[PDB]
């Protein structure tokens, strides 16, 4: 499946598990230890998914975007994806900055790459009053991740980097969230996603780099992209609450 | 493999489903003075036939036994080999 068919239903792009068929099969015996343990760990994730099905409920009528669409306050249009990303970046920056300023913490500054830095060395009363929690920080770091992705697409559209560099850049970001983003500090369970991305990188590279050798250029970013989307699935209700 | 806490290499590993162990057990039933050793019972056997080769197979699921042996011949050559042909792998048919 699916090649023995000639008709079917469309699936979501994130539902095409391209890399999955590799680690359901035996790895090539010559591979080094890190690749083999990567295969083994991805199999662990697959088996634990198959053991414990979380079946959906049928009375799930009030989807968010449809419910908002019924209102006079929300309107439709169509825009380019890079414009939508830039808009969402500006919007999220405005939201977090307004939250900072309503709480009176103008002595904290939010960068346009979503780092939060104090403008001055803070008093103890200022430190207690400005002690933002994991909700704010998780929100901030997700905006930071999205900002990185959008900025690579912006670089491509300015002509600064070509398409292959873009593919490699997206792949690098999704593999190196652990270094670029710091999101684990506020939700340490994301290390499962980071570990899954590392394992995926190992198996992808040792399929990809056969007879090529070392260096950048591998832009097959679809599996890690799926990892982070499926993380966002379960992060939506938590961050909403 | 998870339920029995046995892992063939290459396969995943999990912490045991039943973390207890019958440390109270002392009985003569499987004493080495009574067991006939001829072949070491691999973990592969313990997952192939889980109810035969395990003493307490709690929460195991029965595996699919077998499929008939695959004989799907593939056409290797680009153009010169037609769809239907007597592949070199096949034994001849000497009867007449």
């Amino acid at each position: 499946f699916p090649f023995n068919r000639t008709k079917g239903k469309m699936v979501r792009a994130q539902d095409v598990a391209l890399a999955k068929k590799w680690f359901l099969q035996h790895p090539d015996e010559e591979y080094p230890v890190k690749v083999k343990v990567s295969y083994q760990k991805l199999l662990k994730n697959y088996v634990l998914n198959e053991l414990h099905p979380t079946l959906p409920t049928n009375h799930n009528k009030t989807k968010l975007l449809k419910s908002l669409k019924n209102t006079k306050y929300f309107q439709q249009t169509t825009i380019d994806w890079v414009e939508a990303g830039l808009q969402l970046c500006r919007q999220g920056h405005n939201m977090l900055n307004l939250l900072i300023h309503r709480k009176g913490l103008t002595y904290l500054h939010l960068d346009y790459n979503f780092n939060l830095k104090p403008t001055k060395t803070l008093t103890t009363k200022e430190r207690k009053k400005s002690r933002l929690g994991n909700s704010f920080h998780l929100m901030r770091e997700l905006l930071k991740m999205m900002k990185l992705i959008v900025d690579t697409h912006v670089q491509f559209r300015l002509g600064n980097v070509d398409a292959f560099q873009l593919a490699d850049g997206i792949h690098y970001i999704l593999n190196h969230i652990g270094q670029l983003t710091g999101i684990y500090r506020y939700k340490y369970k994301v290390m499962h996603q980071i570990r899954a991305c590392k394992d995926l990188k190992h198996i992808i590279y040792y399929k990809f780099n056969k007879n090529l050798g070392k260096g950048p250029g591998c832009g097959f970013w679809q599996p890690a992209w799926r990892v982070w989307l499926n993380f966002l699935r379960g992060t939506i209700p938590l961050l909403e609450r | 493999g998870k339920a029995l806490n046995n892992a063939i290499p290459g396969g995943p590993k999990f912490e045991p489903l039943y973390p207890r162990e019958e440390e109270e057990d002392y009985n003569e039933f499987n004493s080495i003075d009574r067991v006939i050793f001829r072949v070491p019972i691999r973990s592969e056997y313990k997952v192939a036939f889980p109810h035969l080769y395990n003493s307490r197979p709690r929460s195991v699921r029965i595996p699919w036994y077998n499929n008939p042996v695959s004989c799907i011949i593939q056409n290797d050559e680009e153009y010169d080999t037609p769809a239907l042909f007597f592949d070199p792998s096949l034994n001849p048919i000497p009867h007449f």
């Binding site: 399929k207 056969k210 007879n211 | 290797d76």
Partner: peptide, 22 residues
Amino acid sequence: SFCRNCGEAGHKEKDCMEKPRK
């Protein structure tokens, strides 16, 4: 053993760098 897709030795069909051809 050789790659039937391009004739070069060593690598398999699945690991070829030239595009597939009928």
